[PDB]
Amino acid sequence: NVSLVDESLLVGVTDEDRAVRSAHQFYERLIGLWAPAVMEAAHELGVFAALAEAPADSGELARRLDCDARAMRVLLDALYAYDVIDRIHDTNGFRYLLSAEARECLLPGTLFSLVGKFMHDINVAWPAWRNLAEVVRHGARDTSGAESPNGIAQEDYESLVGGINFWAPPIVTTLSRKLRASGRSGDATASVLDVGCGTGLYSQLLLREFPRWTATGLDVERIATLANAQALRLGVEERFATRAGDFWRGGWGTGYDLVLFANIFHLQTPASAVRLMRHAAACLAPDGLVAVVDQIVDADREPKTPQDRFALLFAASMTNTGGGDAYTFQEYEEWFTAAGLQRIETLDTPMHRILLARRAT
Amino acid sequence: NVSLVDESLLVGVTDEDRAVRSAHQFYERLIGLWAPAVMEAAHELGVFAALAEAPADSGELARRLDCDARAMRVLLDALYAYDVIDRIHDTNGFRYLLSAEARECLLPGTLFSLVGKFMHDINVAWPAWRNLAEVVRHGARDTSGAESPNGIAQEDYESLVGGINFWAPPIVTTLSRKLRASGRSGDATASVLDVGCGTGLYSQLLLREFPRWTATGLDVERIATLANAQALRLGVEERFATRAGDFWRGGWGTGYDLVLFANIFHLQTPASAVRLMRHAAACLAPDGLVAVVDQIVDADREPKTPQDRFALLFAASMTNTGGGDAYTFQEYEEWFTAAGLQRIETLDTPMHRILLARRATEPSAVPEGQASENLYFQ
Ligand SMILES: Nc1ncnc2c1ncn2[C@@H]1O[C@H](CSCC[C@H](N)C(=O)O)[C@@H](O)[C@H]1O
Numbered sequence: 156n157v158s159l160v161d162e163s164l165l166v167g168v169t170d171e172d173r174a175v176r177s178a179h180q181f182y183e184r185l186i187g188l189w190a191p192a193v194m195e196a197a198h199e200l201g202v203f204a205a206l207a208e209a210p211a212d213s214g215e216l217a218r219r220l221d222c223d224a225r226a227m228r229v230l231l232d233a234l235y236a237y238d239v240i241d242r243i244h245d246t247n248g249f250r251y252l253l254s255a256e257a258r259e260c261l262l263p264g265t266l267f268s269l270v271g272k273f274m275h276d277i278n279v280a281w282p283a284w285r286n287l288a289e290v291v292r293h294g295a296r297d298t299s300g301a302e303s304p305n306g307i308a309q310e311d312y313e314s315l316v317g318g319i320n321f322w323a324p325p326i327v328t329t330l331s332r333k334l335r336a337s338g339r340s341g342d343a344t345a346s347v348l349d350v351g352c353g354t355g356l357y358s359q360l361l362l363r364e365f366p367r368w369t370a371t372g373l374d375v376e377r378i379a380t381l382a383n384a385q386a387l388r389l390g391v392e393e394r395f396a397t398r399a400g401d402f403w404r405g406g407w408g409t410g411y412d413l414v415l416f417a418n419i420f421h422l423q424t425p426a427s428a429v430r431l432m433r434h435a436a437a438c439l440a441p442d443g444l445v446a447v448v449d450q451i452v453d454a455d456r457e458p459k460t461p462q463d464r465f466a467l468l469f470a471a472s473m474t475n476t477g478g479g480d481a482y483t484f485q486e487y488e489e490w491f492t493a494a495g496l497q498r499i500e501t502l503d504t505p506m507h508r509i510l511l512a513r514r515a516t
Numbered sequence: 517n518v519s520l521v522d523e524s525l526l527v528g529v530t531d532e533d534r535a536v537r538s539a540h541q542f543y544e545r546l547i548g549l550w551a552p553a554v555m556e557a558a559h560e561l562g563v564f565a566a567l568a569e570a571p572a573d574s575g576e577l578a579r580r581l582d583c584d585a586r587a588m589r590v591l592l593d594a595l596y597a598y599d600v601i602d603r604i605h606d607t608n609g610f611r612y613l614l615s616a617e618a619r620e621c622l623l624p625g626t627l628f629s630l631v632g633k634f635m636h637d638i639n640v641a642w643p644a645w646r647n648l649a650e651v652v653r654h655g656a657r658d659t660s661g662a663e664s665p666n667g668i669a670q671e672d673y674e675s676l677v678g679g680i681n682f683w684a685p686p687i688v689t690t691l692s693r694k695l696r697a698s699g700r701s702g703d704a705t706a707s708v709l710d711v712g713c714g715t716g717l718y719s720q721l722l723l724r725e726f727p728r729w730t731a732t733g734l735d736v737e738r739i740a741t742l743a744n745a746q747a748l749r750l751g752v753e754e755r756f757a758t759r760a761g762d763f764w765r766g767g768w769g770t771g772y773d774l775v776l777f778a779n780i781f782h783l784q785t786p787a788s789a790v791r792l793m794r795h796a797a798a799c800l801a802p803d804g805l806v807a808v809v810d811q812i813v814d815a816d817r818e819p820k821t822p823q824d825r826f827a828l829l830f831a832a833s834m835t836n837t838g839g840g841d842a843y844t845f846q847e848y849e850e851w852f853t854a855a856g857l858q859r860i861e862t863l864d865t866p867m868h869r870i871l872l873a874r875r876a877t878e879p880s881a882v883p884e885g886q887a888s889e890n891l892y893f894q
């Protein structure tokens with residue numbers, strides 16, 4: 156399906172055979188470089204927007220985009236080989252197009268658009284990844300020698316946050332099922348705090364699921380603007396508010412039934428993480444919950460499941476961009492304890508775990 | 517498996533379900549960026565050589581390599597997540613180490629070392645891949661409009677040729693099995709021409725398989741130097757020779773029983789490809805064979821098999837580096853016909869296909885004469 160090596164043709168177990176087999180497997184990993192390069196170049200050239208507007212043969216698309224015809228065929232067939240675009244082959248030749256699901260992912264301004272991820276890679280991640288050895292040499296450390304938090308800046312998040320909206324629906328449906336099995340129902344009011352809310356999608360999907368709930372997102376000015384616009388598109392604006400500014404300044408509020416941290420703790424240092432956890436505990440209502448949605452692994456750091464394997468890789472993505480980590484269950488439990496909280500649930504999602512915690516006293 | 521997404525937790529019915537599912541699959545493809553970055557950084561830092569010398573925990577490796585302890589933990593655990601390095605468990609914890617098979621791939625100077633591929637990526641391919649958009653805009657067409665061959669240069673091949681040695685053994689095993697099944701044997705004299713031989717591994721492995729054969733490798737002088745050294749390493753130097761120079765000149769000799777083109781045609785334009793095929797036919801014994809080993813796909817260009825999917829991607833790798841293609845079976849058949857050859861076999865290998873061609877047996881359906889000549893010139 157995805158394989159680039161016909162492994163059925165790598166046979167034997169002599170030392171030579173095993174070395175050759177490993178070399179092919181390592182080469183296949185190395186050529187994983189090619190997929191973001193192809194996809195991100197296609198984005199830069201306007202390929203996806205053009206295919207959505209009108210399906211096209213490769214020569215026609217090259218003319219429309221002022222590109223070389225042969226190179227465009229090569230690029231389009233590579234995108235088809237990655238299952239990113241569709242292609243019809245009949246007696247008239249080839250026509251390239253987007254499926255509805257691909258359109259949602261590849262065009263700007265849709266709910267699940269990956270354009271912000273493409274742009275994050277182009278502008279931030281790809282130059283950093285080429286310098287990874289330097290950061291490993293020197294450490295993700297500040298001028299005083301202390302661990303630094305992750306370095307992705309608010310202006311970079313303006314793109315990236317929309318590009319990670321796709322994570323939210325599986326996470327929110329898993330969380331919502333558990334909250335309903337926890338006696339939290341529709342028709343009862345509750346207040347949510349979404350710390351570092353990004354576009355606000357996690358909050359906004361909760362608002363759709365729980366029609367009497369309200370939610371408040373904390374994020375920086377320009378991100379809060381994005382989040383309010385998205386709430387309006389989703390029809391939950393009357394129950395979604397933002398509180399713009401650096402969340403380290405406080406002004407979070409109190410009485411929250413749910414405090415959500417999605418994709419926040421991996422940005423922290425241990426010192427900043429424990430502070431955030433204590434802040435969260437202080438704003439909880441009686442019977443409130445903290446939900447951490449993150450790349451979380453056991454201290455053994457064994458890649459036993461896809462979520463564990465992704466967490467170990469995500470830690471490298473954090474180091475690449477200046478700090479943070481994929482923290483361990485044991486670390487979260489330490490932070491919970493320090494904040495007077497106790498972990499009560501762990502739920503798996505496609506690429507994350509949800510940890511739920513509540514006040515012990 | 518080695519998936520990075522737990523796809524059992526993604527639904528796929530509604531339009532929103534399916535968009536979310538595709539976005540996770542596309543994201544998984546995008547984060548393929550991270551693996552070469554981690555592996556190539558580890559090479560630059562000396563990780564693989566150090567682990568081969570002495571297995572160590574992250575903190576010990578950080579000390580030995582003058583790196584930060586936490587960042588080294590992050591790097592090594594990522595390599596472990598990619599199955600590139602292993603663990604050995606002690607009563608007090610574990611160390612990282614390389615398996616025997618991984619050592620052969622990750623250390624410099626071994627026969628199957630990927631180091632030359634790491635360095636090709638670092639020096640050439642990484643920066644090119646981020647400029648891919650501008651190369652698609654302009655194409656490989658020269659100032660006069662004609663397509664250019666691939667632009668990877670001799671200085672680049674000094675690293676890359678050793679870094680692709682790993683492809684050769686499965687290919688040579690498959691080729692040799694077909695040669696023997698067809699009647700060839702190693703206790704009779706035969707001559708092989710290896711055009712653009714690189715390190716010479718393909719013809720050197722053939723020389724080990726067929727102990728009375730000889731082989732001549734064609735390449736530029738700095739690569740021929742590598743090939744002669746490797747022939748000595750493999751014990752076949754008495755039957756392996758090189759001829760340095762631009763192989764597009766032709767005049768390759770006479771009487772060759774086998775003319776091998778491994779990883780050559782994808783570098784070509786259609787014009788240079790047909791010229792090479794004609795040079796091959798001109799040097800072939802009456803019963804000789806041409807073997808093309810390349811990224812080859814049907815004209816339907818459908819990603820049905822791994823080899824098809826890799827070929828379509830490899831075409832992009834050629835465009836990335838200035839020219840060439842993953843050519844189709846039908847294009848090779850054009851070139852065989854233009855050279856008086858006929859395809860007789862197609863064989864699959866892990867990431868390639870082998871085409872075998874012999875001298876044609878039947879004449880063109882168009883009789884000799886001016887009309888045939890005019891068709892030829894057009
Ligand atoms: N000190 C700080 N104050 C406010 N927002 C912050 C912050 N540090 C990080 N953030 C915000 O935290 C978010 C991290 S990305 C995650 C966004 C969202 N929770 C999601 O999972 O999709 C960004 O929107 C970023 O601007």
Ligand SMILES: Nc1ncnc2c1ncn2[C@@H]1O[C@H](CSCC[C@H](N)C(=O)O)[C@@H](O)[C@H]1O
Pocket residue numbers: 670673677680681711712713714715716734735736739761762763764777778779780
């Ligand atoms: N015009 C030319 N004349 C001579 N050698 C050339 C050439 N163009 C390319 N080459 C050589 O062709 C090789 C291409 S890489 C393939 C090497 C080998 N056949 C293998 O498959 O491993 C390089 O060694 C390069 O130096």
